[PDB]
Amino acid sequence: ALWQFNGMIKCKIPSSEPLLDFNNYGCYCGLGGSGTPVDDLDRCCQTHDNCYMQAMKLDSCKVLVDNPYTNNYSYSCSNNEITCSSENNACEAFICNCDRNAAICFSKVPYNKEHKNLDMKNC
Numbered sequence: 068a069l070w071q072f073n074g075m076i077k078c079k080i081p082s083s084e085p086l087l088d089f090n091n092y093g094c095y096c097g098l099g100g101s102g103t104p105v106d107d108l109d110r111c112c113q114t115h116d117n118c119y120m121q122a123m124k125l126d127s128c129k130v131l132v133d134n135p136y137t138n139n140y141s142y143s144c145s146n147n148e149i150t151c152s153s154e155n156n157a158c159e160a161f162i163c164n165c166d167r168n169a170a171i172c173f174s175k176v177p178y179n180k181e182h183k184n185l186d187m188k189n190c
């Protein structure tokens with residue numbers, strides 16, 4: 068879920084509060100998304116959004132009422148390395164992977180403050 072993703076991003080980037088630094092950034096980082104990504108970080112979020120859209124189409128995810136933002140899964144952080152647990156079922160695992168790839172993406176690309184709270188009229 069959302070809380071897991073927060074800790075997952077702090078695992079890769081120890082000095083930030085993901086819910087603040089990465090929320091409402093560009094056209095995709097944050098609830099929703101549309102238009103052409105403004106930068107790679109925004110592209111990281113785009114991919115993450117597609118990943119979620121994909122997960123929602125899994126027979127295994129449809130059975131449960133939990134939302135990708137509200138579905139708790141298991142993972143660990145160790146030596147700043149993220150590991151999705153094998154105790155996770157199909158749906159959770161898929162989501163866990165979506166969040167893992169996004170966290171790493173976040174930590175490998177530039178951050179442009181100018182894009183924080185971007186005017187959704189650029190999307």
Ligand SMILES: COc1ccc(C(=O)O)cc1
Nearest residue numbers: 085086089095096097098
């Ligand atoms: C806490 O950071 C994020 C970043 C991107 C996504 C999103 O697009 O909703 C969610 C949370």
Ligand SMILES: [Ca+2]
Nearest residue numbers: 095097099100
């Ligand atoms: Ca989004």
